[PDB]
Amino acid sequence: EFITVARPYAKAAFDFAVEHQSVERWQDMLAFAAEVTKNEQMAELLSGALAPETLAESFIAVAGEQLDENGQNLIRVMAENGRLNALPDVLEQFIHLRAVSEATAEVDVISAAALSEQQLAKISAAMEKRLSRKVKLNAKIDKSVMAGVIIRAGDMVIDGSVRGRLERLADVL
Amino acid sequence: MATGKIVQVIGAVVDVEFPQDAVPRVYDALEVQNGNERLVLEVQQQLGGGIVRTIAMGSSDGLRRGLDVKDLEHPIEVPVGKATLGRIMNVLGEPVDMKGEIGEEERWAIHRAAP
Amino acid sequence: TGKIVQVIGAVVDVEFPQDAVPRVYDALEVQNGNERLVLEVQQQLGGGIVRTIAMGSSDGLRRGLDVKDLEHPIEVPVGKATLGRIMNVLGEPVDMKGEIGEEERWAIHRAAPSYEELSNSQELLETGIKVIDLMAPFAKGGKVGLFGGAGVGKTVNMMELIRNIAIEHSGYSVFAGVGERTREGNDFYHEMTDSNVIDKVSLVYGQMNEPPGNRLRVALTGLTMAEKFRDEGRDVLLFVDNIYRYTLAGTEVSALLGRMPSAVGYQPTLAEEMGVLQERITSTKTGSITSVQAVYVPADDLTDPSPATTFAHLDATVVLSRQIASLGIYPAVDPLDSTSRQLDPLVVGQEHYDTARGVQSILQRYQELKDIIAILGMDELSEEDKLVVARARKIQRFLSQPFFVAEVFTGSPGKYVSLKDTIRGFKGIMEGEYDHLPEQAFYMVGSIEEAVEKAKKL
Amino acid sequence: NSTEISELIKQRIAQFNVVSEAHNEGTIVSVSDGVIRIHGLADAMQGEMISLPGNRYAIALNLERDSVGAVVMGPYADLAEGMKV
Numbered sequence: 001e002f003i004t005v006a007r008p009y010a011k012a013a014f015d016f017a018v019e020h021q022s023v024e025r026w027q028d029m030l031a032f033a034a035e036v037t038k039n040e041q042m043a044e045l046l047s048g049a050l051a052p053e054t055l056a057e058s059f060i061a062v063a064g065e066q067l068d069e070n071g072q073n074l075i076r077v078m079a080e081n082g083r084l085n086a087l088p089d090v091l092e093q094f095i096h097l098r099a100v101s102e103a104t105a106e107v108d109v110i111s112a113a114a115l116s117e118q119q120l121a122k123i124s125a126a127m128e129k130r131l132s133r134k135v136k137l138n139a140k141i142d143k144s145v146m147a148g149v150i151i152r153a154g155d156m157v158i159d160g161s162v163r164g165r166l167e168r169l170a171d172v173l
Numbered sequence: 174m175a176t177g178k179i180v181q182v183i184g185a186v187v188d189v190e191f192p193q194d195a196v197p198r199v200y201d202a203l204e205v206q207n208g209n210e211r212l213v214l215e216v217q218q219q220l221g222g223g224i225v226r227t228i229a230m231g232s233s234d235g236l237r238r239g240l241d242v243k244d245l246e247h248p249i250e251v252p253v254g255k256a257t258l259g260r261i262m263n264v265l266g267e268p269v270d271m272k273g274e275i276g277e278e279e280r281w282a283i284h285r286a287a288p
Numbered sequence: 289t290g291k292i293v294q295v296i297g298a299v300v301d302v303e304f305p306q307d308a309v310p311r312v313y314d315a316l317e318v319q320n321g322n323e324r325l326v327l328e329v330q331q332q333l334g335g336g337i338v339r340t341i342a343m344g345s346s347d348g349l350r351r352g353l354d355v356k357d358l359e360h361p362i363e364v365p366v367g368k369a370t371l372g373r374i375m376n377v378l379g380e381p382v383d384m385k386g387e388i389g390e391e392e393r394w395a396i397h398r399a400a401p402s403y404e405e406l407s408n409s410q411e412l413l414e415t416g417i418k419v420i421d422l423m424a425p426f427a428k429g430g431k432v433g434l435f436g437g438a439g440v441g442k443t444v445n446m447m448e449l450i451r452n453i454a455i456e457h458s459g460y461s462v463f464a465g466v467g468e469r470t471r472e473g474n475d476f477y478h479e480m481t482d483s484n485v486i487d488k489v490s491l492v493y494g495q496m497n498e499p500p501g502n503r504l505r506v507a508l509t510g511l512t513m514a515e516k517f518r519d520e521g522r523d524v525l526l527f528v529d530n531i532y533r534y535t536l537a538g539t540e541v542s543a544l545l546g547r548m549p550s551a552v553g554y555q556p557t558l559a560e561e562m563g564v565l566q567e568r569i570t571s572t573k574t575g576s577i578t579s580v581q582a583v584y585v586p587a588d589d590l591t592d593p594s595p596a597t598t599f600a601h602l603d604a605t606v607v608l609s610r611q612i613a614s615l616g617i618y619p620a621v622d623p624l625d626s627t628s629r630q631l632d633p634l635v636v637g638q639e640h641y642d643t644a645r646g647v648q649s650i651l652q653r654y655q656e657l658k659d660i661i662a663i664l665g666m667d668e669l670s671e672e673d674k675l676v677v678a679r680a681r682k683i684q685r686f687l688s689q690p691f692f693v694a695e696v697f698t699g700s701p702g703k704y705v706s707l708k709d710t711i712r713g714f715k716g717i718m719e720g721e722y723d724h725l726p727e728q729a730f731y732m733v734g735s736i737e738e739a740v741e742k743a744k745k746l
Numbered sequence: 747n748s749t750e751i752s753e754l755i756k757q758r759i760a761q762f763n764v765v766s767e768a769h770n771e772g773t774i775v776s777v778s779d780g781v782i783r784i785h786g787l788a789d790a791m792q793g794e795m796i797s798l799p800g801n802r803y804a805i806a807l808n809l810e811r812d813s814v815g816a817v818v819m820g821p822y823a824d825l826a827e828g829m830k831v
């Protein structure tokens with residue numbers, strides 16, 4: 001998967017955007033660059049073994065919403081190594097690094113039923129001290145858990161669901 | 174007019190990149206200026222993207238990346254006929270003795286099909 | 289739902305929606321021209337890609353073909369409905385007769401019986417073959433392995449074992465042809481039908497002409513039928529025409545599955561692939577399976593990993609040597625490499641054990657002397673060494689035996705030899721009672737009395 | 747704002763005339779020792795006869811994700827990258 005190869009490009013792009021205080025525009029440009037990659041004819045074009053410079057100049061043609069001095073440089077650098085398919089992953093790693101830099105964390109909450117605002121507030125307050133970062137909760141209550149709640153942040157998971165208790169109890173067999 | 178440029182030099186193996194519409198065929202002969210002498214390269218493999226991979230017919234030392242490459246469109250051609258008798262030649266058909274130029278009448282490609 | 293994305297020889301990759309990825313060993317179905325092609329899932333790659341092996345000819349497959357997901361593994365008919373019929377690897381009938389009256393179908397991939405269920409047995413099973421039951425006797429419900437190169441006579445020995453053993457065994461039998469000659473399968477089927485014993489035998493045939501998937505999975509179908517017969521509580525006989533082809537098919541498909549080569553280029557999972565198949569062929573407290581397996585030896589190298597791994601799974605091993613076969617001695621059993629778990633004084637008794645060990649020692653001494661004989665000739669030997677050589681040659685001749693199935697080759701009629709007669713004859717030969725007879729007297733004689741009768745006319 | 751940029755992408759690719767190859771047609775990507783790598787041929791099948799320029803054929807052995815591996819049923823030295831098949 002392009003996860004490992006996307007990292008240097010995402011890091012470089014994020015550092016550059018930080019030095020120029022233009023992170024949001026970069027994120028939008030990265031999203032646009034990731035969308036054109038998914039185009040069906042562009043996918044065949046990218047799969048073909050064109051020369052790096054001709055493929056790059058053809059890619060720049062389909063993008064008029066890019067900051068040319070920096071976005072074109074990015075695309076040409078990725079083109080010279082054939083990494084253009086990694087753009088959807090470069091975007092995700094750029095978002096992740098931005099969230100780390102802003103000390104902000106997304107948290108998913110799953111329960112049998114919709115929670116009250118006070119419970120959400122206590123959850124957010126506990127998680128902010130657990131992570132020492134700002135948090136943004138989202139609620140994705142589920143049909144299968146019949147009681148309790150699940151809290152997932154990053155990959156650390158706290159389970160209080162009754163389903164989890166039922167399975168953990170049967171394990172003592 | 175030279176159309177290709179050298180991109181890799183690893184021992185005797187030399188890689189040359191050509192425009193996509195002018196990639197030389199296999200077994201064709203290229204030549205480059207290796208300082209003060211012409212060095213002939215034989216095409217072995219056509220790689221993707223216009224890059225060709227060649228075996229140098231001579232000393233590879235002193236080759237820089239980016240040197241211009243002239244694409245001779247015929248395979249290695251050597252003089253033939255009565256003029257060759259009594260003469261010493263290398264693989265390229267150049268005289269190795271000091272007895273001057275060969276009075277060639279024809280030059281034939283070395284790669285040809287069997288009867 | 290699925291889409292084909294790669295076709296590399298026998299291996300086909302299929303992409304599925306990430307919520308519906310088929311499990312390992314699930315059977316898939318795809319229309320290939322004017323016929324239906326079954327694919328078996330081997331590996332789950334990332335992103336909903338799954339890697340499969342085609343149970344048929346993969347030519348004519350395009351990219352982007354729609355693939356249908358069956359929710360169950362390959363399941364084959366089992367039970368008495370399979371008796372007397374020829375069946376494909378997929379459990380389809382191959383004879384021109386109608387559909388199989390199946391009542392139940394079983395998945396071919398099954399777990400081995402647990403350690404508790406295993407049963408021990410020591411009932412010696414008699415054969416008509418002097419060398420086999422003398423040097424390497426085997427018990428009912430055990431494993432027998434015939435090792436040999438190309439052309440040494442594994443199949444002839446297996447047919448003779450079938451003929452002899454079927455006499456005192458009234459239960460069902462299963463014959464699984466794996467990657468062998470189709471001609472031999474047709475001949476066997478016709479000779480079974482002519483003898484009206486076909487109705488007791490289930491035949492699963494995937495021969496060498498088949499693509500690798502059929503040869504790879506065919507043995508498991510035969511094993512599943514044998515296990516069905518066993519769990520019913522019967523005593524079954526299983527014959528595998530060539531176990532080596534299964535590992536060979538694994539080797540052929542291994543590279544395309546993206547696995548690095550090992551050893552001599554075999555698949556890294558060679559030992560596990562062999563063990564998972566071999567462990568299911570076992571007698572159990574509910575029922576017993578007697579198994580005879582021919583094991584091809586590539587390039588006559590008994591040290592190749594494929595023969596080497598098989599040696600540990602078998603109870604009795606009979607090794608056939610090309611050098612002996614070139615002498616015209618048949619069966620070309622090598623008595624200094626053949627061995628059985630049953631050659632134990634407790635089970636076989638003292639007399640059989642002593643005769644076998646005496647024969648083994650005499651032949652070992654002859655092998656030791658042969659290097660001197662080659663250079664200096666026999667004249668240099670001591671007078672006891674010459675007697676050892678003379679007795680060893682007589683023993684080597686006496687091990688030969690005319691087979692009933694070989695009458696089409698030798699012409700001479702076959703012989704059946706009891707264990708009592710062979711042990712008495714070999715003990716008499718070693719004691720020197722017959723030292724006045726010529727070597728040729730013992731060649732291709734059933735019993736020692738026939739040997740002395742042949743001596744009168746030389 | 748995603749559907750509009752996607753249709754803008756379609757409009758732009760239409761403007762600059764980048765278009766996929768036709769089915770049953772492809773282009774030679776590389777040539778070495780008689781083995782041919784071909785891009786396209788979305789409707790090729792395993793074991794098919796692929797007609798080359800001139801009057802010779804290649805046999806499709808591998809249907810990779812992005813290319814077809816083929817062997818030339820004759821002299822291969824005259825073939826060149828970018829030839830239509």
Ligand SMILES: Nc1ncnc2c1ncn2[C@@H]1O[C@H](COP(=O)(O)OP(=O)(O)OP(=O)(O)O)[C@@H](O)[C@H]1O
Pocket residue numbers: 436437438439440441442443444445584618619689690691694697698
């Ligand atoms: N008892 C016998 N008498 C005479 N010839 C015999 C005897 N047993 C085997 N042979 C010889 O063995 C030869 C080959 O036998 P068979 O077909 O069983 O070999 P195989 O080991 O199964 O070989 P393959 O590896 O080709 O399948 C026959 O041609 C036959 O002449």
Ligand SMILES: [Mg+2]
Pocket residue numbers: 442443
């Ligand atoms: Mg055989």
